[PDB]
Amino acid sequence: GAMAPSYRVKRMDIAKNDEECVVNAANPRGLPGDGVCKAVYKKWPESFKNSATPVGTAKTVMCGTYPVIHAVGPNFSNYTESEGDRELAAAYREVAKEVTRLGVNSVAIPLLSTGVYSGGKDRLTQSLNHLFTAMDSTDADVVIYCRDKEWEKKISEAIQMRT
Ligand SMILES: [Cl-]
Ligand SMILES: [Cl-]
Ligand SMILES: [Cl-]
């Protein structure tokens, strides 16, 4: 466990994190993919051996001793808002189980389904709240990654609101 479990946000490439494991914003087929998934493939390609897993689940594959937790959010181009919301909440609960099982003291996590899976919508709040629902009961230090300056400010504000 971390001494004083916390949330933080950083605006940078999650492939350059300083945490004990990474959550990939994976596709269901374990393909190199786009966005976060492509940066994770470049940095940890060994972790895509048998990484394919269904929507709403997470599958961990070791790169050396470094855990890559492949978390598959729904593509809101394909899902209804209602079923999409259910699967996005489920993917984060599976992330919390894996982070707990691994016994890490820190984890780097992106906002699932906010990129090319967002179906053209701003899902910062929806995705972040499902992240909190899942990770609040874990004692790992959580570091949320983003790339947009206005997203960094909104994520930071949401963290500070609860403190
Ligand atoms: Cl960066
Ligand atoms: Cl995405
Ligand atoms: Cl972003």
From Swiss-Prot:
It is a peripheral membrane protein. Coiled coil: none annotated. Interacts with mRNA-capping enzyme nsP1. Interacts (via C-terminus) with host G3BP1; this interaction inhibits the formation of host stress granules on viral mRNAs and the nsp3-G3BP1 complexes bind viral RNAs and probably orchestrate the assembly of viral replication complexes. Interacts (via C-terminus) with host G3BP2; this interaction inhibits the formation of host stress granules on viral mRNAs and the nsp3-G3BP2 complexes bind viral RNAs and probably orchestrate the assembly of viral replication complexes. Interacts (via C-terminus) with host NAP1L1. Phosphorylated by host on serines and threonines. Signal peptide: none annotated. Residues 4-163 form the Macro domain. It is found in: Host cytoplasmic vesicle membrane. Changing residue 13 to A: Partial loss of ADP-ribose 1'' phosphate phosphatase activity. It comes from Chikungunya virus (strain S27-African prototype) (CHIKV). It comes from the Viruses. Changing residue 117 to A: Partial loss of mono-ADP-ribosylhydrolase activity; complete loss of ADP-ribose 1'' phosphate phosphatase activity. The chain holds residues 1334 to 1493 of 2474 of the full protein. This is Non-structural protein 3. In the N-terminus, the macro domain displays a mono-ADP-ribosylhydrolase activity. The central part called, the alphavirus unique domain (AUD) has a zinc-binding function. The C-terminus region, also called hypervariable domain (HVD), is mainly disordered and binds several host proteins. This intrinsically disordered domain contains 2 SH3 domain-binding sites and 2 FGDF motifs necessary and sufficient for the formation of nsP3/G3BP complexes. Seems to be essential for minus-strand RNAs and subgenomic 26S mRNAs synthesis. Displays mono-ADP-ribosylhydrolase activity. ADP-ribosylation is a post-translational modification that controls various processes of the host cell and the virus probably needs to revert it for optimal viral replication. Binds proteins of G3BP family and sequesters them into the viral RNA replication complexes thereby inhibiting the formation of host stress granules on viral mRNAs. ADP-D-ribose binds at residues 13, 27, 35, 115-117. Changing residue 27 to R/Y: Almost complete loss of mono-ADP-ribosylhydrolase activity.
